[PDB]
Amino acid sequence: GLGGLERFCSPGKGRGLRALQPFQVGDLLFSCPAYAYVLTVNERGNHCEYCFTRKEGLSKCGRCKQAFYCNVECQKEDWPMHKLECSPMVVFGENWNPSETVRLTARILAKQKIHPERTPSEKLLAVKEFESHLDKLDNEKKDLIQSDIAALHHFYSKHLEFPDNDSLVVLFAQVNCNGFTIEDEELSHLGSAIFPDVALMNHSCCPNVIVTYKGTLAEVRAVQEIKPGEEVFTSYIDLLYPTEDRNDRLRDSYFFTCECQECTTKDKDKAKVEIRKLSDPPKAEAIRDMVRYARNVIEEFRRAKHYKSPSELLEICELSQEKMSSVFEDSNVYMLHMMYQAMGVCLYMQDWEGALQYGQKIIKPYSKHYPLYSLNVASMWLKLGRLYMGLEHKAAGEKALKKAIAIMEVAHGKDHPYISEIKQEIES
């Protein structure tokens, strides 16, 4: 189905989505209800488990007191999926630690037993039809799937009937590369879901669509004019980084290399890796070393985001920046990576001033490096606005919040609950 769209074979790629009618900028292509979903553990007090709405003072689950809901209606409708974790959270207590993947694969198995037939989440692609890339996964990723399986058994023993090891390996591999992360208006991680039809769409570093969420509902809107017969492209990755960096990430998770206009021309590559205009210009050899150092420290930081302290993480950001500053211009995407990373640590530690100072340095190069309609730009203006408003800068506040609404009206749509919320912030 899906009015004015069709599944097809995209040459040189595979299964894709194609427009059959035109779509102007801001037009809703389709909506895909969540086949399976979960709210992340760290967002448990702030958000409803069933619809993901952000509210303070949510009703608690009487049994576990770990799940929070808008009303009894969200609580009752959530129970089929919550019963998988409700009694095991009480039994295991603070030891209850299944990974978000294990948590999601559990809901998938539950949806397979209650609704074995094609769901409205599966109008053009089925979960069972998902790519698993099992032939391509290393020993590390296969060991984590074995680990995931043991965790599923250890934490969901009492509420599920499990298929054999081989069936569960395929499913865990499938979820790993097909699972969607859901973010809020600020790009903060909210949870994980299965959107079978959204997963049909192929990748481009110049996308003509963006995926946003209305609670657990995924929404696909046009960010470029789409003509009948043109293929529908979303971006699988973060479009801030140069071509090699994007293709390295693409190969890592989806084992394919990109061939779009941006990957071909590499026009934004020189500007993304901006170099200081020194009287003695740094040598190509020195430019090479700083790019490697940066890519190395980016990996070092992600790993450190597990064991090192927020004040330790900041030292890495600050010293990495200071080191890179020898060759890299402040608009360089590697500098910007660490500025963003320290902003997140500042927002974490509630250093609203430190965060605001990062954002201010981040936003002009962001609108220069990302496309016009980009969730990273809108969420950065939204974060700047909210911080400005919090620190008594109303003129700079309304200015940044309006700039967020501008992009967001096109991505999230003019009637989105987010736009209203932000408007209430300017008005009241």
Ligand X SMILES: Cc1cc2c(ncn2C2(C)CN(C(=O)c3ccn(CC4CCN([C@H]5C=CCCCC5)CC4)c3)C2)c(N)n1
Binding status of residue 35 toward ligand X by CB under 6 A: no
Q: Is 70 annotated as a binding residue?
A: yes
User: Closer CB to ligand X, residue 75 or residue 202?
Assistant: 202
Stretch that binds Zn ion, among 73-81, 265-273, 384-392, 398-406 (CB under 5 A): 73-81
Q: Which does 178 bind (CB under 5 to 8 A by kind): Zn ion, ligand X, none?
A: ligand X
Helix, strand or coil, per DSSP, at residue 72: helix
CA dihedral 350, 353, 359, 360 (to 10 degrees): 170
Token pair listed for 100:
């978000």
Stretch that binds Zn ion, among 82-90, 116-124, 276-284, 299-307 (CB under 5 A): 82-90
Among the listed residues 256, 293, 301, 352, the single contact to ligand X using CB under 6 A: 256
Binding status of residue 261 toward ligand X by CB under 6 A: no
Q: What values do phi and psi take at 274, rounded to 5? A: -60, 130
Binding status of residue 8 toward ligand X by CB under 6 A: no
Dmax of the chain from CA atoms? 70
Q: Is 61 annotated as a binding residue?
A: yes
Q: Is 74 annotated as a binding residue?
A: yes
Stretch that binds ligand X, among 36-44, 66-74, 117-125, 195-203 (CB under 6 A): 195-203
Rounded to whole angstroms, the Cα distance separating 375 from 207 reads: 13
Asked if 66 and 37 count as a contact pair (C-beta separation under 8 A), the reply is no
Shortest distance, position 31 Cβ to ligand X, whole Å: 17
User: Closer CB to ligand X, residue 213 or residue 388?
Assistant: 213
Binding status of residue 199 toward ligand X by CB under 6 A: yes
Distances (CA, A) of 387 to 314, 326, 344: 20, 31, 13
Binding status of residue 178 toward ligand X by CB under 6 A: yes
Rounded to whole angstroms, the Cα distance separating 204 from 189 reads: 23
Q: Which does 61 bind (CB under 5 to 8 A by kind): Zn ion, ligand X, none?
A: Zn ion
User: Closer CB to Zn ion, residue 67 or residue 290?
Assistant: 67
Binding status of residue 74 toward Zn ion by CB under 5 A: yes
Binding status of residue 217 toward Zn ion by CB under 5 A: no
Shortest distance, position 163 Cβ to ligand X, whole Å: 21
Residue with structure tokens 């919550």? 82
Token pair listed for 179:
């699972």
Among the listed residues 97, 181, 296, 326, the single contact to ligand X using CB under 6 A: 181
* Angle between helices 284-304 and 333-349 in degrees, nearest 10: 20
Q: What is the DSSP letter of 96?
A: -
Among the listed residues 1, 9, 13, 414, the single contact to ligand X using CB under 6 A: 13
Strands annotated E in 251-392? none
Q: Which does 51 bind (CB under 5 to 8 A by kind): Zn ion, ligand X, none?
A: Zn ion
Shortest distance, position 251 Cβ to ligand X, whole Å: 10
Among the listed residues 37, 69, 213, 236, the single contact to ligand X using CB under 6 A: 236
Q: What values do phi and psi take at 52, rounded to 5? A: 70, 5
Stretch that binds ligand X, among 24-32, 155-163, 197-205, 369-377 (CB under 6 A): 197-205
Strands annotated E in 231-276? 231-234
Among the listed residues 105, 202, 212, 243, the single contact to ligand X using CB under 6 A: 202
User: Closer CB to Zn ion, residue 67 or residue 211?
Assistant: 67
Shortest distance, position 354 Cβ to ligand X, whole Å: 28
- How would DSSP label each residue in 133-188? -TTT--HHHHHHHHHHHHHHHHHHTTT-PPPPHHHHHHHHHHHHHHPEEEE-TT--
Asked if 154 and 118 count as a contact pair (C-beta separation under 8 A), the reply is no
Stretch that binds ligand X, among 21-29, 72-80, 176-184, 411-419 (CB under 6 A): 176-184
Q: What is the DSSP letter of 50?
A: T
- Residue 71, H or E segment: none
Asked if 391 and 352 count as a contact pair (C-beta separation under 8 A), the reply is yes
**Pick from 341, 244, 328: which is nearest to 302 by CA?**
341
User: Closer CB to Zn ion, residue 51 or residue 201?
Assistant: 51
CA dihedral 354, 358, 360, 361 (to 10 degrees): 140
Stretch that binds ligand X, among 162-170, 249-257, 265-273, 368-376 (CB under 6 A): 249-257
- How would DSSP label each residue in 28-45? EEEEE--SEEEE-GGGTT
Asked if 274 and 268 count as a contact pair (C-beta separation under 8 A), the reply is no
Q: Is 133 annotated as a binding residue?
A: yes
User: Closer CB to ligand X, residue 226 or residue 297?
Assistant: 226
Stretch that binds ligand X, among 6-14, 48-56, 116-124, 341-349 (CB under 6 A): 6-14
Known binding residues for Zn(2+): 48, 51, 61, 64, 70, 74, 82, 86
Residues that bind Zn ion (CB under 5 A): 48, 51, 61, 63-64, 67, 70, 74, 86, 205, 258, 260, 262-263
